[PDB]
């Protein structure tokens, strides 16, 4: 998933774009992956 961005993996935007310009795309992917990880942890805690 892209989480509202132009790509999914950070290795793609880091290979085509520059870090000073694609910094907002990396931050959106990190916050998106962190939210999914937080949801999976809460689901695992309920299952536990």
């Amino acid at each position: 998933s892209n989480f509202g961005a132009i790509s999914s993996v950070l290795n793609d935007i880091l290979s085509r774009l520059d870090p000073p310009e694609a910094e907002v795309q990396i931050d959106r992917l990190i916050t998106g992956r962190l939210q999914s990880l937080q949801t999976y942890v809460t689901q695992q805690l309920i299952r536990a």
Partner: protein, 96 residues
């Protein structure tokens, strides 16, 4: 033939030149002619050699200097609405 030429097309009747199966480099373009706005969206001009694209399409057209800002993914005006408009998730960039 793609840069520093003498005859191009219009903005509505442009041609899609097929540029494929070759070595597309950007460092060998500064010695031919000077570029005014080497702006690029969605792709960095310095990372063109590390990666490799596929079936590069060449869309060349001559417009006015006041309309140089309308060539962007998500602009509005007379070229971005009634003429060839760049897509939102558009990969690739423009040399003007």
């Amino acid at each position: 033939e793609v840069f520093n030429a003498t005859r191009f097309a219009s903005v509505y009747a442009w041609n899609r030149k097929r540029i494929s199966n070759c070595v597309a480099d950007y460092s060998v373009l500064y010695n031919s002619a000077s570029f005014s706005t080497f702006k690029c969206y969605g792709v960095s001009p310095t990372k063109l050699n590390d990666l490799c694209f596929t079936n590069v399409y060449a869309d060349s057209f001559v417009i006015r200097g006041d309309e140089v800002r309308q060539i962007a993914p998500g602009q509005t005006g007379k070229i971005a609405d009634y003429n060839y408009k760049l897509p939102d998730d558009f990969t690739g960039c423009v040399i003007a």
